[PDB]
Design a protein around this nucleic acid. Structure first.
Lengths: 31, 115, 65, 96, 275, 88, 149
RNA sequence: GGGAGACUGGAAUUCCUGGUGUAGCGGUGGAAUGCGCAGAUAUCAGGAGGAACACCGGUGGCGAAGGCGGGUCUCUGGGCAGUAACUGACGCUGAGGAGCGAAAGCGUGGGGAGCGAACAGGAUUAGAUACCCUGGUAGUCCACGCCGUAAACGGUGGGUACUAGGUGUGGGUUUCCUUCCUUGGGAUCCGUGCCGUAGCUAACGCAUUAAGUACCCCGCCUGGGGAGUACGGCCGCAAGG
């Protein structure tokens, strides 16, 4: 199939990973 | 000194050629490089620069008493052909031609591919 | 093509001691000759390669003279 | 009790007339271990393909033994420990 | 091996103790034990010369045979492996065939009932002692002498080994555990194999009590001292000393080996740091 | 695997008669001997996972054979289990 | 160098002969046209109608084997087994020059190796085993053409 | 070249030492950082150390999958063929569950030649947190353990029976040309490719190694985003799953 779907999925996963990197310490302090 | 018989080591890389005449016990007696004959940068990767370096090394060995020599080529082909032709053309007799290139038996990791 | 001189009824055994039978199978540079240029079967080619390597290990054949 | 073939290369300086007796003593252990049979052949003073331990010539000896694997390993250890043995190589004359 | 204490108490949380698996006897030989009393780090004048010493559990000295030069040609049988408090390594009790008992530091892999021989005709099994001239190059040795007769001095700690590189002339080039390369006369005897108890360094001592039992007084930092006591002392609040680091007697950091020692000619290359 | 003599002695001791080799008793005995040998081997080489898979296959086959025996005749199953020490 | 191809990518350098790599290269052309003594002009005429760039003959005055070839813009060039001056060489009218180097002594495999590592259209040499002249050239099928007496 | 352990071989790279030896070497599309003139590069001799095993070597072998080739020894798993002596349906699948599971990554202890995230400069560019160049730490390696993910793909779950052929190639049995040397050819069993009927498909294509004709069992899908995300829970040192 076309790689457009894979592009959407990788963008979503990348954004989630960046969010996790940004809030790692806050999650640890609240967890 | 006077060394009637010696060896010639030619290392022709992709961007330079180095020619060295050697007393057969392994002692360099006269060497000429591609950049030593007035070339610099990519200009010294040309076969003409190899010709000039080989001729200069041949003269710098000839006045030292070298008459007959045997050549050990080495390196990817840039100016080896012209190097040996110039070694002959400068009055230096060529005894034998030997291709001794360091060939690993798949050892060490080569650098990553360019793009 | 060519003949696997070992699959024949007169096929001499392959050993790392008999150096001439191996020298006839390596090129002048000492490299092991290909199977097609020789024509022997796969098992005999593998046995020849193993014998050549062993003979090199025991200093009976040069390592690329 | 399996059959083995041990090829040894010794330095050329030592006299050949002592190679056969000395090697004999080296097999004595494997002779007294489990009732083993030996066949010794010597074709030495042949120049090596490449330099081994600052040497160009070497004495080649072939020993056909029929013994236990532990005994052969112990014999190989002793042979490698000896300073007059340049190299040893052990093969199995069985299907392997 | 290493046995880790369960975190039942705050003093035992991260603690661990050596699992004395190789020890085969809980008592030493009565004829090989000499009295030993603690000095406290104080020399013949009664003044403290080495700080952070004193206290600690009382211990006795087991006479170790670092000079195995008499029993050449006499085989010995390892009778036991015991615990020596004066050293990190474990000691093995030998029973020579003539009827004499001796103590040696147990090499790596030595087991009860093994046969230990010595001399020029000895084998190259671990535990055997023979002069460096008869030891083939490349092997691993320990308890090496420095002069032909002075006894073992080098590679005596636990898990420590010396790699014999090669012999030339009358000198053998050894790679010390520090990585330093030194030459030594070939007449010096050596023992084959690594030293046992290699896992001892992985011990976590848990609390200050263990160190106090081992005989180590607390060590006070220099920046919490006063300027009369230490060069780093003084200042309001915490400080770094306000001066390049120095010993309590003012000697600055750097090389302290005295130059032009007579042994400088026998050192091939010194150890290296930060490589 | 086992040598010919070990197989012969196991078959003679556990076989129903002097000829059978595929009887479930003989198969279970041979599998148990192989399993104990493989366990003794694996106690030295802990990281030999492929032989561990082979051991798992042998264990499963022995369990299936014991299931068949217990389904056909209970007394034979009890006798075999008690004779081979086979826990189950 | 070889990976990937584009419109302006450098065209592959192809020799005149069919490749026929060292594997089964062989020597399947052995001419022995003429060894009757000739002079320089006669050798040049024997060159011209044969349409061959080089030609191996035996010289009149010397009695030695020699090879003539086109010396390029300099004219023609003559190579002898042992270099001799023009005076000993038989009289001629064509403008030629003599190669000062002598034909060396070397084996068959060494000759093939020298030809490969020296890239000349041919190699003229005194064979080690034979002791006589020989000219090897890469043929038009990839094999080496060894011309012998 | 199925797996584990032990010992060991050579070429080559790097570094060190000692000769000969000079003014450049290196690098690129072109250069500059960089190295060298305190003696570099080159050449010879010696030494140390680590990693990977040129030729054999392929759409060829083994393995359930990941994956697996320098040599020798020890231990060990699986497969195929023939005889059909033996047991006599003991078979298939398998919710959960357990085990194995590329690389990257984590912990403890070692090792560290080459390569090399990060990080420095050099260069290109309007801008270069990049592509190219010079250096280079983790890491890549070993031992014991963790994690449990991949375009982990043949994007094709496992077992069985049947349905035109033709031709390569691996392994094993046998009849006839018969020299019996020979891929002689035939027959047959087990793999591994290519082309092609019927048939199937939306088409591309698959086509005896089915994506054809049918039977047994399991897993999975119900428009695209939100989202394999939030909450809750389990596992994990952590990343995270």
């Amino acid at each position: 199939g076309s790689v457009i779907k894979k592009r959407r999925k990788r963008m979503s996963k990348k954004k989630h990973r960046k969010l996790l990197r940004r809030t790692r310490v806050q999650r640890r302090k609240l967890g | 000194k006077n060394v009637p018989h010696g060896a010639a080591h030619i290392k022709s890389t992709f961007n330079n050629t180095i020619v060295s005449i050697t007393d057969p016990q392994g002692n360099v007696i006269a060497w000429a490089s591609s950049g030593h004959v007035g070339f610099k940068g990519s200009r010294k990767s040309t076969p003409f620069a190899a010709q000039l370096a080989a001729e200069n090394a041949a003269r710098k060995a000839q006045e030292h008493g070298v008459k007959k020599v045997d050549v050990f080529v080495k390196g990817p082909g840039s100016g080896r052909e012209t190097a040996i032709r110039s070694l002959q053309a400068a009055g230096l007799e060529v005894g034998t031609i030997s291709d001794v290139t360091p060939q690993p038996h798949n050892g060490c990791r080569p650098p990553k591919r360019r793009r | 093509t060519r003949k696997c001189v070992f699959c024949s009824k007169k096929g001499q055994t392959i050993d790392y001691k008999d150096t001439a039978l191996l020298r006839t199978y390596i090129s002048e540079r000492g490299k092991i000759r290909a199977r097609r240029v020789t024509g022997n079967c796969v098992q005999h080619q593998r046995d020849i390669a193993v014998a050549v390597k062993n003979a090199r290990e025991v200093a009976l054949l040069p390592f690329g003279s | 009790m399996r059959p083995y073939e041990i090829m040894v290369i010794l330095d050329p300086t030592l006299d050949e007339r002592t190679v056969a007796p000395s090697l004999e003593t080296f097999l004595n252990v494997i002779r007294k271990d489990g009732g083993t049979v030996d066949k010794v052949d010597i074709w030495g003073r042949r120049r090596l393909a490449y330099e081994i331990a600052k040497h160009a010539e070497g004495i080649y000896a072939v020993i056909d033994v029929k013994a236990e694997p532990a005994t052969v390993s112990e014999l190989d250890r002793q042979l490698n420990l000896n300073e007059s043995v340049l190299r040893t190589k052990v093969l199995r004359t069985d299907k392997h | 091996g290493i046995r880790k204490y369960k975190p039942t108490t705050p003093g035992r949380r991260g603690a661990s103790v050596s699992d004395f698996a190789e020890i085969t006897r809980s008592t030493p030989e009565k004829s090989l034990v000499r009295p030993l009393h603690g000095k406290g780090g104080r020399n013949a004048h009664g003044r403290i010369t080495t700080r952070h010493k004193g206290g600690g559990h009382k211990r006795a000295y087991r006479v170790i045979d670092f000079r195995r030069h008499d029993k050449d040609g006499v085989n010995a049988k390892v009778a036991h492996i015991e615990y020596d408090p004066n050293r990190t390594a474990n000691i093995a009790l030998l029973h020579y065939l003539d009827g004499e008992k001796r103590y040696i530091i147990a090499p790596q892999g030595l087991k009860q009932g093994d046969v230990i021989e010595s001399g020029a005709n000895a084998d190259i099994k671990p535990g055997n002692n023979l002069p460096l001239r008869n030891i083939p190059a490349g092997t691993v040795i320990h308890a090496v002498e420095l002069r032909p007769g002075g006894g073992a001095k080098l590679a005596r700690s636990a898990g420590v080994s010396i790699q014999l590189l090669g012999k030339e002339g009358t000198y053998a080039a050894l790679r010390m555990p520090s990585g330093e390369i030194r030459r030594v006369d070939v007449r010096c005897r050596a023992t084959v194999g690594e030293v046992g108890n290699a896992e001892q360094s992985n011990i976590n001592w848990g609390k200050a009590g263990r160190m106090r039992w081992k005989g180590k007084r607390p060590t006070v930092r220099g920046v919490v001292m006063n300027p009369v006591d230490h060069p780093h002392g003084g200042g309001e609040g915490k400080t770094s000393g306000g001066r390049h680091p120095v010993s309590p007697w003012g000697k600055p950091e750097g090389r302290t080996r005295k130059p032009n020692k007579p042994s400088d000619k026998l050192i091939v290359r010194r150890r290296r740091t930060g490589k | 695997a086992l040598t010919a003599e070990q197989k012969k002695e196991i078959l003679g001791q556990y076989g129903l008669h002097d000829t059978d080799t595929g009887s479930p008793e003989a198969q279970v005995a041979l599998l148990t001997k192989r399993i104990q040998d493989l366990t003794e081997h694996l106690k030295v080489h802990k990281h030999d996972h492929h032989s561990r898979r082979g051991l798992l296959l042998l264990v499963g086959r022995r369990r299936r054979l014991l299931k068949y025996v217990a389904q056909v005749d209970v007394a034979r199953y009890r006798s075999l289990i008690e004779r081979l020490g086979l826990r189950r | 160098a070889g990976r990937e191809w584009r419109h302006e990518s450098e065209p592959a350098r192809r020799p005149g002969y069919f490749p026929r790599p060292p594997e089964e290269r062989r020597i399947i052309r052995r001419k022995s046209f003429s060894m009757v003594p000739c002079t320089v002009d006669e050798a040049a005429l024997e060159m011209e109608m044969l349409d061959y760039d080089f030609h191996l003959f035996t010289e009149k005055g010397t009695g030695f084997a020699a090879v003539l070839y086109k010396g390029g813009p300099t004219g023609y060039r003559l190579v002898l087994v042992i270099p001799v001056p023009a005076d000993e060489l038989s009289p001629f009218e064509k403008p030629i020059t003599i190669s000062t180097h002598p034909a060396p002594c070397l084996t068959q495999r060494d000759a093939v190796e020298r030809l490969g590592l020296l890239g000349l259209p041919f190699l003229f040499y005194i064979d080690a085993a034979e002791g006589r002249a020989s000219v090897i050239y890469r043929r038009y099928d990839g094999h080496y053409g060894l011309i012998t007496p």
